[PDB]
Structure formats: structure tokens, C-alpha cells
């Protein structure tokens, strides 16, 4: 019974991208600040063109899983649609912190807009759920944007480098690094050759509030 479960390993993803570029550059100067500091840390960055915040994992396994996922992002639109009526949802960046000493990520600052995030992440949890796809992780949720990954280095985590030390970052513990409008949700493939411009293979996308 517990064994498809068990197997359970997430291949697609929800991502809000960052598209505002006082956020992108800010990353940037971030990560080469951390590299100033201890030059082989370079290859625990994440791509610029990669920078997005996640809504949820799931494993999809075949086209007609593919397919499903599709449907159920077409379908989170109108849910979307009814908790924002029109209103910007507006994320801001500032605060950083780390899951296990090893994925480096800037946090959403507090304020409304979490919970109204937490809730759209909570509907499409479900709603997916609902038909049948698999989804979630033991890591609770937190809305996050990663700019390192300890993973991305395997060699250096046994020959030096097993944590992030959080006084690499101290400079840029209080800065505000911009907001991000919630325009675009795409659904991407975590292990398809990468677009052009560094950001994920996209299966589909909605856009919230266009005009």
C-alpha cells in the first residue's frame, strides 16, 4: 500500500517567476558577495534566470499526468480570480534563512500578503490533490526564493563545506531586495533541458489579473 508513496519522488512544479529586475540584480550582488568571501562557494549558486518562488512539487509520470496538471492549473485561475477580485497581490523580499544549514533562500517579509499566498498555495494543493496527482513534501511549506544550494556541490560538501555559515550573509540580513507583482504561474519540469534564458521548461502558464 505505502509503496507508491514511498517511491514518491516530485518531477514538475508550480513557479511564480521573478521578472523585476531590482530583485534579480539584488540576488546577483548577494551570491557574488558570498563568493568574495570563500571563492568555492560559486558553484552552490543558483542561475539567475532560474530565480522563482514555488507554489508546489508533484510528480507527474506519464503525458496523461502531464495532461492532468495542465487541467488543474487552467482550473486554479478562476479560484485565484475570486480571493485577489482584481487587487494586486504584491510579495516584498527581505529577511534570509536556510533549511538545514544548506539551500540559502530570501524569505517574504510578513505582512497580508503571506496569508493571501499561503491560501492560493493551500487551493492548488488540493485541488491537485483531487485528481488524482500526487504532491507535497515532508519539508513544511514557506514561501522562499533560494539563491544556493550546498546540493549543487556535492564534492566541496565532503572535502570542506557541509553548512552555510550565516555570517557570509550578515550584510544583507535586513535588506529589502523589491517586490513582485503576481502576474504569471507557470508549470515547469524540474529535469527538462532549461530555456534559452536559463529559466525552467515550461508545460503550461496562467496569468492573474491581465489587462
Given at each position: 500500500?505505502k509503496?507508491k ?11 511564480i ?5 531590482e530583485?534579480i ?16 562557494l ?5 542561475s ?7 507554489l ?5 509520470l506519464?503525458?496523461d499526468?502531464?495532461n492532468?496538471?495542465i487541467d ?6 478562476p479560484?485565484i480570480?475570486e480571493?485577489?477580485?482584481?487587487k ?12 538545514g ?15 493571501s499566498l ?5 487551493t ?25 544550494k550546498?546540493s549543487?556541490s556535492?564534492w566541496?560538501?565532503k572535502?570542506?563545506?557541509?553548512k ?8 544583507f540580513?535586513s ?23 536559463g529559466?525552467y521548461?515550461?508545460e ?8
Open positions: 500500500r509503496k508513496r514511498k517511491d514518491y519522488q516530485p518531477n514538475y512544479f508550480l513557479s517567476p521573478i521578472t523585476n529586475k530583485i540584480k539584488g540576488i546577483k550582488i548577494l551570491q557574488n558577495a558570498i563568493i568574495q568571501q570563500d571563492e568555492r560559486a558553484k552552490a549558486m543558483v539567475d534566470g532560474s530565480f522563482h518562488i514555488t508546489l512539487v508533484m510528480q507527474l506519464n503525458e499526468e502531464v492532468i496538471g488543474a492549473l487552467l482550473e486554479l485561475k479560484f480570480e480571493l485577489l477580485q482584481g494586486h497581490l504584491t510579495l516584498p523580499f527581505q529577511g534570509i534563512g536556510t533549511f544549514n544548506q539551500v540559502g533562500f530570501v524569505k517574504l517579509a510578513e505582512g497580508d500578503h503571506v496569508n499561503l491560501e492560493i498555495a493551500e492548488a494543493n488540493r485541488t491537485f490533490q483531487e485528481k488524482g496527482i500526487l504532491v507535497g513534501e515532508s519539508r513544511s511549506f514557506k514561501p522562499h526564493l533560494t539563491f544556493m550546498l549543487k556535492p566541496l560538501r572535502n570542506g563545506v557541509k552555510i555559515d550565516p555570517d557570509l550573509y550578515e550584510k540580513i535588506h529589502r531586495f523589491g517586490e513582485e507583482i503576481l502576474y504569471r504561474i507557470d508549470l515547469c519540469s524540474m529535469l527538462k533541458k532549461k530555456q534559452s534564458n529559466y521548461h515550461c503550461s502558464s496562467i496569468v492573474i489579473g491581465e489587462k
